[PDB]
Design a binder for this molecule. Structure first.
Ligand SMILES: *Sc1ccc(N)c(F)c1
Length: 462
């Protein structure tokens, strides 16, 4: 009488800077996506999410104490006893992943890690924790980061982002060229990112007036995370739902009636103008279903100087496919061919380059021959592969499997075997046995380094 495997799940993401205070008795509004912003319909209140991922910062509780509160809250909402998938804490930065008990045998390859940011006097409270796992055929990654504070420190925050994405060790270690921004079908990155509304401090009361009027446009046009993303300084290739809730920081505790912005000894004589510190972003592989269903803040949880933030997603997932052939052999019907491909790179290097193709649909990664370097009119390096690239032999040829897969590409120096660029191509093509255009930007350490384009031709068993 077996349950069919799901094609979609829903995922709850929560981020809350607890302000080193215990929570109040009831926090159910957080997990129900109730309060301000894009909120969840009351008719869904009893419907559990498949996975709940809870990020806290300045968390004063033990793991045991917080788990008890989280599992009690979900049991009260859903009448389901959730299973702990993972919990990881760095200082007062914590991530908890809970899942429905029906998913226990669908979840495997659980990994946890942390990154400590800063050096000397800036090393010791900021950084990130993360969790990854497989859910049937789908890889999922989660990062909770507490970045550097202070309106004046946006460039430090961006540097913290770069260190966390470089050094966090999650997902499949065989993906050696790839950082966390390429290792997962779906990556969620959330936390107290600490980006501020960059307006003069003498405009504090004007900001507060705008918030009372629910007029956020002239505030969001100064939000440092939106502006730094627009200028491609941080979070390149990530998505964020539109913000329609009031700034989540800095509140007087025990009410939400008051923003506490003025400089005090306790703030290091810094102003804390109302800001959207607390954020949820995501990055999914191309042409994978991911829809944000809610993004908002609670109104009734007042123990911290921050309000909790919620986001929920519908995320596509795939099954653990088994054929008569693969896993454990190739499906000789299937092939992936690349035509007229070239990489464009921002490097001043003149080493030869080769490609690596990595995918779960291959027995192991495939190394190309070196490309042919030409110079581009506007200075650039163009690496031509023509029709020279290997024919890739997937383990399964069934189009129901193969059109859902993705090929990661790294372009590496022949001289150093270091990756100069990483990207991803979807096999969710408009046609099979047809030459079709393909494209990915290339990044290294999460920054743009070039592009890969050409044509693909996919053979399936149909
Ligand atoms: S689970 C896991 C273990 C080790 C590394 N490097 C990972 F990325 C993940």
């Amino acid at each position: 009488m077996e349950q069919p495997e799901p094609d979609m799940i829903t995922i709850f993401i929560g981020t809350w800077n607890m302000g080193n205070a215990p929570p109040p008795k009831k926090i159910t509004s957080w997990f129900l996506s109730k309060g301000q912003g894009k909120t969840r319909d009351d008719s869904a209140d009893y419907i559990p999410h498949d996975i709940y991922v809870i990020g806290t910062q300045e968390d004063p509780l033990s793991e045991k104490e917080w788990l008890e509160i989280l599992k009690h809250s979900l049991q009260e909402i859903t009448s389901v006893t959730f299973k702990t998938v993972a919990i990881h804490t760095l200082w007062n930065i914590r991530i908890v992943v809970l899942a429905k008990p029906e998913h226990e045998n669908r979840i495997s390859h659980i990994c946890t890690d942390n990154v400590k940011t800063g050096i000397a006097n800036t090393l010791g409270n900021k950084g990130a924790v993360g969790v990854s796992f497989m859910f049937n055929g789908t890889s999922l990654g989660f990062v909770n980061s507490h970045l550097t504070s202070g309106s004046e420190k946006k460039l430090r925050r961006n540097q913290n982002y770069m260190n966390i994405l470089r050094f966090l060790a999650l997902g499949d270690k065989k993906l050696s060229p790839f950082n966390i921004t390429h290792r997962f079908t779906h990556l969620f990155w959330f936390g107290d990112l600490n980006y501020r509304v960059d307006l003069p401090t003498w405009e504090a009361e004007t900001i507060i007036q705008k918030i009372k009027q629910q007029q956020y446009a002239d505030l969001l046009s100064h939000d440092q995370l939106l502006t730094e993303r627009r200028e491609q300084k941080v979070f390149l290739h990530f998505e964020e739902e539109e913000i329609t809730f009031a700034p989540t920081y800095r509140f007087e505790r025990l009410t939400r009636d008051k923003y506490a912005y003025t400089k005090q000894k306790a703030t290091g004589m810094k102003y804390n103008l109302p800001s959207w510190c607390d954020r949820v972003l995501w990055k999914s592989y191309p042409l994978v279903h991911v829809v944000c269903q809610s993004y908002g803040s609670t109104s009734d949880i007042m123990t911290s100087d921050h309000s909790p933030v919620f986001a929920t997603f519908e995320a596509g997932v795939t099954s653990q496919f088994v054929s008569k052939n693969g896993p454990g052999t190739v499906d000789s019907q299937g092939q992936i061919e690349f035509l007229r491909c070239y990489a464009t790179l921002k490097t001043k290097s003149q080493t030869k380059f080769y490609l690596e193709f990595h995918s779960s649909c291959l027995e192991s990664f495939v190394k190309s021959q070196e490309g042919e370097n030409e110079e581009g009119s506007e200075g650039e390096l163009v690496v031509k592969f023509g029709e020279t690239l290997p024919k890739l032999k997937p383990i399964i040829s069934d189009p129901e499997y193969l059109l859902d897969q993705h090929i990661l590409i790294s372009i590496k120096s022949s001289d150093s075997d270091e990756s100069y660029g990483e990207g991803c191509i979807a096999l969710r093509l408009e046609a099979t046995e047809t030459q079709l255009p393909i494209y990915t930007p290339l990044t290294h350490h999460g920054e743009l380094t070039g592009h890969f384009q050409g044509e693909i031709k996919l053979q399936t068993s149909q």
